[PDB]
Amino acid sequence: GKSYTDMLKDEKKAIERFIDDKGLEILDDFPADSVFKENQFVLLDNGVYLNIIDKGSDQRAVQYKTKMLYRCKMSYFMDSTIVAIENYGPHSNGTSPIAFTYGDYSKNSPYDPSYYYVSEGMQEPLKYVGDRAKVKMIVPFKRGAYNDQSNGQPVYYEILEYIFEENL
Numbered sequence: 291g292k293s294y295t296d297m298l299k300d301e302k303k304a305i306e307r308f309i310d311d312k313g314l315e316i317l318d319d320f321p322a323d324s325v326f327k328e329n330q331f332v333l334l335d336n337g338v339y340l341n342i343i344d345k346g347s348d349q350r351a352v353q354y355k356t357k358m359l360y361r362c363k364m365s366y367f368m369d370s371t372i373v374a375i376e377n378y379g380p381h382s383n384g385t386s387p388i389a390f391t392y393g394d395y396s397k398n399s400p401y402d403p404s405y406y407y408v409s410e411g412m413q414e415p416l417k418y419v420g421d422r423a424k425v426k427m428i429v430p431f432k433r434g435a436y437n438d439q440s441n442g443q444p445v446y447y448e449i450l451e452y453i454f455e456e457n458l
Contacts, residue, residue, distance in 0.1 A: 297431070317332040351454070396409050
């Protein structure tokens with residue numbers, strides 16, 4: 291198999307290519323009021339790139355407690371353009387959101403949904419946004435779902451909406 295080091299290298303290259311190909315502007319810090327332009331992403335301490343489209347409510351999730359649901363469009367980009375999840379937007383008719391509790395980790399059994407659908411990266415923005423918030427992200431594999439950690443795959447969330455289950 292490919293060394294961890296080579297995996298980091300292929301990903302680093304794929305991300306620079308992706309940023310350049312889409313003409314994105316990488317910030318060092320949060321912009322004024324957490325307002326972003328369509329093409330701006332802040333690079334967080336843990337390695338995930340974030341754009342906030344909609345900041346949501348003032349409420350903040352509590353680790354190990356808050357029950358969440360999400361809808362998103364998530365895609366690969368390093369070796370292909372395959373769409374992996376599509377339960378947001380016009381073509382997501384009949385789909386339901388995906389459930390997790392804030393603080394959950396991605397298990398390494400391929401028969402558990404968290405292996406594919408939960409990650410530290412998907413959850414990072416919950417430090418900064420609230421209910422019905424919408425975000426865009428590039429999540430490197432170190433912070434990704436176990437499925438993606440194992441294959442060294444970064445993912446791109448074209449759009450992701452958070453739903454707090456307690457306010458339903």
